[PDB]
Design a protein around this nucleic acid. Structure first.
Lengths: 261, 256, 216, 56, 217, 47
DNA sequence: GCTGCGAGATCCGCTCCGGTG
DNA sequence: AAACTTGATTAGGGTG
DNA sequence: CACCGGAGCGGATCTCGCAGTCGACCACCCTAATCAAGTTT
DNA sequence: GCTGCGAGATCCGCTCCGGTG
């Protein structure tokens, strides 16, 4: 989606949204949108698969609650203790369920336990322990646990197994519970991943960096070659590149590109 | 009718009237009537604040539910200015209900009366509900932050105001590419549809009812209320089950 | 889509409840203490929270054919088919999925202190790192299918409407007074289709002359 | 009926954007808003999956 | 064809504006008083008299990229492509063009009074007397290319039928979906010629990954 | 004709038939692979 | 590089229901 | 001796 | 031999003139010319 | 005791004559 991208930064420098809203509106690959926000100083002046996990005690049952930061999608499972190693098991299985890119958490032992961090490295996750400072995520996560314990309190009498009812709250909140036009956080996530796929098959050429020389036309008259600059988003018959002059993404048809091998 | 089947589900799982509407495609005023009537869990609904930004008294409106907003820059927080503001505010919408606090122009008798002229629910009280209050706060903070982005870009302040408004209402999106405006439009769709399809028709009526066993008519049962009269059917609570039921009008005796 | 199959499997005295999706081939597994009904009720609750099944196959074994299990598949609202699994298309994939399951367990389990971390490893290899065809993995197929469901849903929900405008088409000359109501057969950019009632005649109608309407 | 000319302006605005209702007893507001629901891109974009044939 | 390249070159304090045809290898050159835009405008008016350019390459030099030089290219309706010279396909030809040129100049300039006479000599050697393949000169390749570009050649193609085709693309042998349908641009043997809609690229498709579409009846 | 690899030239190839000219590039058979190619006009020498 | 349709009173073409030689 | 150049403020023409 | 096309005539449809005969004033946006002050050769 | 009609240019339909497999 070469065309959408310059146009989307153009919208953003004006209107200063989430990278979300640009990705969704303009139908681009999102990480370009995230780049625009990171390349929009204004939204860096004022400030997918990203999670936060907080152990929570309900009725003397340690509940390890993963909270996805964007969709509001959540996971949890009853955990025996706050041990590092049990949490290592839980994040191995949980990493088998999800495709987490990144994580927030506090400094509690299992998260800062060294081989846990070595294991988050072993799976290729960015783990950030720290006193979480962000009301963006912390409102979501606080609210998440309030709704969690309240809805557990609704559901647990209906089931023999507290694990079955824990699954109950997971069902009601991630599936049954919806918003807006019918958005469960699950289906939000499903969308996030499916749209991550199609960029992802483009990402394999993107992770390797190319540079190019590039030019543009005036009344069809080609200007001189410009760059060397990175090949930012590969299109069909074109790419995207940034104008170093205007600080703006720009489409260049492959004819008006020379890739720098 | 999906409405009694949705009710059968909420009596089990107890979701949000949000998610009951969304799941079942039932009305949200229906769905809200469920959550109000479900003892387990026991729209067009807004809130106002005034606030100052750069010594600019600015009226605010924030929908409670879609989250979508309106505001206007204001000369003073007085009654009559507000009265015209809510004339127009009403005018841009079809508001059913509101929350606000006890402030003078809000609680003001001609202004309250004026709600009654509009025939609308006004509630002043120290707003207690963290559901609303966080969203209100996010609105103000986000908003004046977005002014702080945008207002240098504009000759006019209230142009820039329109700008921040656009950002939050529209250009911002969440979920599936839902700005709150998307949400609201969808809400008003099925809600005006249920409203037109249901509310103005008939109110406060009882009936006798039966159910069919292999098509064999049951005894006439009740008397109970007709909760939502449908097209060719109704909605009724069987008293024994504590569950709502679609009943076909042929199996109804409307009690006059 | 979202049609699954369960089988119990024993990998070195560790009972493992093996959920197998039929189309995408995306798999789930979790370690099991016993094959009893109640434990499977917990597992299919959690699993129904993690995966959003329509439907299921399995054998006739006690936990599945157990009463409150079945009642719980209805309370969760899944189609549960118990019976002698007869289908080569399924049972080929079920069998090979078990074969590759214990294959890759036997690969990864030395590498991991906990066995559930290891079986989690195998789930990762097959669900995710395994790639075939043009290079899509199973979880990509599955996520794509879940999305495709909702695509069907919304696409329907706009099909459901059948809107009718008013228009001003032909009749002598220039522009006439408003006409219809006739329903939107097809949307254009700047135009649509209608029928002409009088002539029964479909028409290419520019939205310059079109007013759009709910029939009711 | 009003203190304000412009509240009366609101009143006219109200009425004809709403209270004027006709044909099937619908405002313009009905139709705009309805069509915004029908102006939606996704259901609108979703339909691509449906088959094409060509024809002569 | 008619895709040319220029590079100025100095040979013994004589600027030589060396036209290079990117296909035939035919060239034009002349001794030039200065690399100025204006003199170059005159040179390319003469040259557009002696040749019929569609298109051009050159470097970004001042004469070429000059505004009224560009306006002159458009006044003549020629495609002017200025750039960092980045191609070894054509820059091989241009490199050995100037090397061979200075070689032949160094041969002939004693043999004639004027350097313009001898420079013309080099043009004669390399355009006319230079022969290759079956004995075709590069000037012969140019005339042949020009002679074969005729719109009476367009006429016959316009008379013909077209048939249409779906097509697919194999990746590691994994066939893509049928696509389009599209024109058969040309019937091949075991293949045909089409264009990609998506990439706007001429493509060959194997006749099995062609489905030849039936005509009306 | 000749081909590129990362832009870098292959040697001249052919002679092979002039089969279908397009805009900017043509069609030849690759005699090596028994499969047709397309070659930029600048990348061709006709005979 | 753009186009008179809309608000306001009247009246014929039809149907549903009631009276009766 | 002459010339050449720039910031604000008034005279005409086209839309409500 | 039925369907379609071309030329001529009839029925239907939209816009405007006769109501005397036409021109000032306010406000905003766009285009253009001259005085006081500052440079050189 | 007084009331809007007619001229201009298009657009569609009907009739007579001629061409097509």
């Amino acid at each position: 989606w070469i065309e959408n991208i310059p146009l989307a930064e153009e919208e953003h420098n004006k209107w200063h949204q989430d990278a979300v809203s640009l990705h969704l509106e303009f139908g681009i690959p999102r990480t370009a949108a995230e780049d625009i926000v990171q390349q929009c100083d204004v939204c860096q002046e004022n400030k997918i698969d990203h999670w936060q996990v907080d152990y929570t005690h309900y009725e003397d049952k340690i509940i390890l609650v993963w909270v996805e930061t964007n969709s509001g999608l959540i996971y949890a499972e009853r955990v025996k203790g706050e041990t590092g190693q049990e949490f290592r098991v839980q994040t191995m299985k949980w990493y088998a369920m999800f495709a987490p890119k990144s994580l927030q958490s506090d400094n509690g032992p299992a998260f800062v336990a060294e081989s846990t961090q070595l294991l988050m490295k072993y799976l290729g996750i960015e783990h950030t322990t720290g006193i979480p400072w962000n009301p963006q995520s912390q409102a979501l996560v606080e609210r998440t646990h309030q709704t969690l314990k309240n809805t557990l309190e609704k559901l647990i009498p209906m089931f023999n197994a507290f694990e079955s009812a824990l699954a109950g709250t997971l069902i009601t909140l991630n599936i049954k519970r919806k918003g807006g036009l019918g958005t469960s956080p699950m289906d939000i996530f499903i969308f996030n991943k499916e749209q991550q796929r199609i960029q992802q098959q483009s990402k394999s050429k993107q992770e390797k960096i190319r540079f190019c020389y590039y030019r543009t036309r005036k009344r069809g008259h080609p200007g001189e070659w410009q760059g060397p600059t990175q090949v930012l988003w590969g299109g069909d018959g074109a790419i995207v590149v940034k104008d170093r002059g205007t600080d703006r993404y720009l489409v260049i048809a492959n004819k008006d590109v020379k890739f720098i091998p």
